């Protein structure tokens, strides 16, 4: 599957590709305003996210540092970045179907579209000023907006039973971004799209 990444932010982001336990193409990529990466997904990939990195510094070797999103150090990301990150989540080729969501569980950096480019499902956005908005507690100094379990570490924002309801601060998320995952026992807003159709992420849309 082609997922064509879009940084139409002002700013530069560090684009990264990851299914937790291996990078996707080449794992990540700077992308300055207006550029575009094209990245082959496989089919059959489960649990692929993509988002995007602030403020990174990298030497030629590849290695540094990001203010979010870090992903131990590495331009290339073999695993998930570090909060706080908005999270395009995607499984391809599950029983003939695709699912896409956006995520807000593991906080908000970058404001992103994920749509498709064939036909036959819809786009989720997440567009609002997020970090603007963010309660005190949870603003990050780096930057971004982390989510509650980040911060807290308690059971019932972290849904470590299996069982939590919504909170203060998953309504906050859910207030400005109906379409994303607010918490980990949220009302799924997943798409369901035709197998094998293909994508693209957009940060900054608006």
């Given at each position: 599957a082609t997922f064509e990444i879009v940084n139409r932010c002002s700013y530069t982001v560090w684009?990264?590709?990851?299914?937790?336990?291996?990078?996707?193409?080449?794992?990540?990529?700077?992308?300055?305003?207006?550029?575009?990466?094209?990245?082959?997904?496989?089919?059959?990939?489960?649990?692929?996210?993509?988002?995007?990195?602030?403020?990174?510094?990298?030497?030629d070797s590849g290695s540094g540092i990001c203010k979010t999103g870090d992903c131990g150090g590495l331009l290339r990301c073999k695993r998930f970045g570090r909060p706080p990150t908005t999270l395009a989540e995607f499984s391809l080729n599950q029983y003939g179907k695709d699912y896409i969501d956006i995520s807000n569980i593991k906080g908000f950096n970058v404001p992103m579209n994920f749509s498709p480019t064939t036909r036959g499902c819809r786009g989720v956005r997440?567009?609002?000023?997020?970090?603007?908005?963010?309660?005190?507690?949870?603003?990050?100094?780096?930057?971004?907006?982390?989510?509650?379990?980040?911060?807290?570490?308690?059971?019932?924002?972290?849904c470590t039973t299996g069982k939590c309801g919504p909170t203060e601060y998953s309504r906050f998320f859910k207030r400005l971004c109906p379409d994303a995952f607010s918490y980990v026992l949220d009302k799924p807003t997943t798409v369901t799209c035709p197998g094998s159709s293909n994508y693209r992420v957009t940060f900054c849309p608006t």
């Amino acid at each position: 599957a082609t997922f064509e990444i879009v940084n139409r932010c002002s700013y530069t982001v560090w684009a990264a590709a990851s299914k937790g336990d291996a990078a996707l193409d080449a794992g990540g990529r700077q992308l300055n305003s207006g550029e575009s990466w094209t990245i082959n997904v496989e089919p059959g990939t489960n649990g692929g996210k993509i988002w995007a990195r602030t403020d990174c510094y990298f030497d030629d070797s590849g290695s540094g540092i990001c203010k979010t999103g870090d992903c131990g150090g590495l331009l290339r990301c073999k695993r998930f970045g570090r909060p706080p990150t908005t999270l395009a989540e995607f499984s391809l080729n599950q029983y003939g179907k695709d699912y896409i969501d956006i995520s807000n569980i593991k906080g908000f950096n970058v404001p992103m579209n994920f749509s498709p480019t064939t036909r036959g499902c819809r786009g989720v956005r997440c567009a609002a000023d997020i970090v603007g908005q963010c309660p005190a507690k949870l603003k990050a100094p780096g930057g971004g907006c982390n989510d509650a379990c980040t911060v807290f570490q308690t059971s019932e924002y972290c849904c470590t039973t299996g069982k939590c309801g919504p909170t203060e601060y998953s309504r906050f998320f859910k207030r400005l971004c109906p379409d994303a995952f607010s918490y980990v026992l949220d009302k799924p807003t997943t798409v369901t799209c035709p197998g094998s159709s293909n994508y693209r992420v957009t940060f900054c849309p608006t």
